[PDB]
Design a protein around this ligand. Structure first.
Ligand code: HEM
Ligand code: HEM
Ligand code: HEM
Ligand code: HEM
Lengths: 146, 146, 146, 146
């Protein structure tokens, strides 16, 4: 992932203001609502019938916080995402068999959640920076398939 | 596209509140900035070299407004997206030769712009409905390749 | 799907030379080997651990011929794919939750299988026509998501 | 790209029987026929009006030879695709603005041309190996967008 310092500044500044405990659950929950086939991976989480059921699921919220945590991790090592994510790649690919396209969709939902939250501060160049990051993390997660 | 009563009422309500000037140049600008290869289609527009040049450009802004106008038309005929978009399909496909994937990328940018432009009212079910709409439009636009 | 009369004639002539009992198993099996996350959907098939575990799997072979039968249906009803695949769309979308991208991969694998089998009779325009067909089928199977 | 030695050997062994002078032109030509929007990049090659026109084009055949030449380089340097394709990445991204999805499509057409050529030598594990190589080359080519 190649970010200019201006880009690195703007991404981290935005990041610093993310409600980590909420954003994660919102991004995971919206993934399940918007791209419904993804619910197949989380059937053990309980009731996912309605959007309300999904958005209200505390297992979804809890897990969402864990996803956001790893995201914060890659953000700290843009230099080496493959290695940062090596362990999560074996899990998601070798054990869970998640389609590589799903990693890209979660990336997308995340960018949407930020736009939604940071309105005007989510500028075109900031959107561009985050797009490159979510793409970099998605590619690092599908590494086991490469 | 298949929208549930709720989704459709939902959809058409928010649309009515859309500031096309704001959303159109924003959607079009963000496409050229986030996915740079898209600039080659708009060489006739001038200075697109920087996010500022792009976001500044009134050609971009005016064209953006035209794109939303076609969207609106589309929104009125969710029943016949294909027929609604026939002439634009011929233009984009047969004449311009735009990659069908780019119709998906504009759609996604547009969704991020609505999140951005409706904050709190852009709930998971609304995003889910708008995602079906944009995918529907992208598919109707790529119709000539099918 | 829009085929010119020359496309329709060549597509239908080639299809009549296909050994159904065989190409369907070959296409489903290659899908499972080349895009390994797809194995997660074939819950009762047993060992899918090695290419030979997959390719000679009796259930893969039997199942491939049912897939092939459905494709034939498709080809015979290009004017009505959504209707033709109505119950298969609800099974795959509503019940099985197959990601739409997967429908596309299987179409791509089938095309490769025909190339492998027909060699030189698989000309560029025949390939282009088959591409439009498999894309139309994938689109009709993902109907319930639209 | 992760290839087992078994895969590596099956891959290089087959590459050795490729008609260097022909497969390239076939691949490129089928790209232009099957995904017609790619014709916009080769409008200076002359007449691409028809499949026959495309497949006939001597510019296409000559250019296919160079493409295949680049592929052999990648094959010879699986451990250094990014360096191997450094200059080609700057040409295609920075200079030509080719959409990254098109690199993917070319790799896919190539695999189909190999299938079409090798019949039976093109077994499921060989196809899987080739799919990982093409994906790795497409990703290396798109590096400038990352
Ligand atoms: C691309 C961004 C993603 C990140 C950063 C991420 C991160 C994580 C993390 C941190 C965990 C918990 C690891 C542990 O408990 O050791 C996890 C587990 C899991 N993830 Fe993801 N993930 C991503 C994408 C996805 C996608 C797209 C899906 C499926 C649609 C998915 C499905 C799962 C599942 C099923 C589990 C296991 C949860 C359980 O049963 O405890 N992940 N992921
Ligand atoms: C969401 C899908 C899209 C819609 C609804 C749309 C709509 C339109 C409209 C309404 C026009 C004006 C045609 C006229 O009145 O003469 C137009 C033209 C054009 N579109 Fe799009 N468009 C879409 C996607 C795209 C994409 C993805 C690209 C390229 C990346 C693109 C490139 C162009 C170009 C180059 C023109 C011609 C501009 C000129 O020189 O006049 N469009 N489009
Ligand atoms: C390209 C289009 C496809 C066609 C025409 C097709 C066709 C079929 C047909 C005819 C059946 C049997 C329905 C019945 O029970 O009567 C079936 C079942 C099934 N398909 Fe597909 N399919 C397609 C793609 C896929 C893909 C991409 C996946 C997953 C990767 C998939 C997974 C399944 C599963 C898991 C079943 C049920 C098998 C069982 O009986 O356990 N299908 N499909
Ligand atoms: C993905 C694998 C690809 C490889 C290995 C590849 C390789 C090459 C090579 C070796 C050249 C000659 C560069 C030089 O020495 O001037 C070239 C040029 C070119 N390629 Fe590609 N290419 C690939 C994909 C594509 C795609 C998908 C497109 C567009 C659809 C494309 C469009 C072009 C164009 C327009 C040129 C310039 C032709 C000229 O004027 O010489 N390339 N490519």
């Amino acid at each position: 992932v190649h970010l200019t310092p201006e880009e690195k500044s703007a991404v981290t500044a935005l990041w610093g203001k993310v409600n980590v405990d909420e954003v994660g659950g919102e991004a995971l929950g919206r993934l399940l609502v918007v791209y419904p086939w993804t619910q197949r991976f989380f059937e053990s989480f309980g009731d996912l019938s309605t959007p309300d059921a999904v958005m209200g699921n505390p297992k979804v919220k809890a897990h969402g916080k864990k996803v956001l945590g790893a995201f914060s991790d890659g953000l700290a090592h843009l230099d080496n995402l493959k290695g940062t994510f090596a362990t999560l790649s074996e899990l998601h690919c070798d054990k869970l068999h998640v389609d590589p396209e799903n990693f890209r969709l979660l990336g997308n939902v995340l960018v949407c959640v930020l736009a939604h939250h940071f309105g005007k501060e989510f500028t075109p160049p900031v959107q561009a920076a985050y797009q490159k990051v979510v793409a970099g993390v998605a590619n690092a997660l599908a590494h086991k398939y490469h």
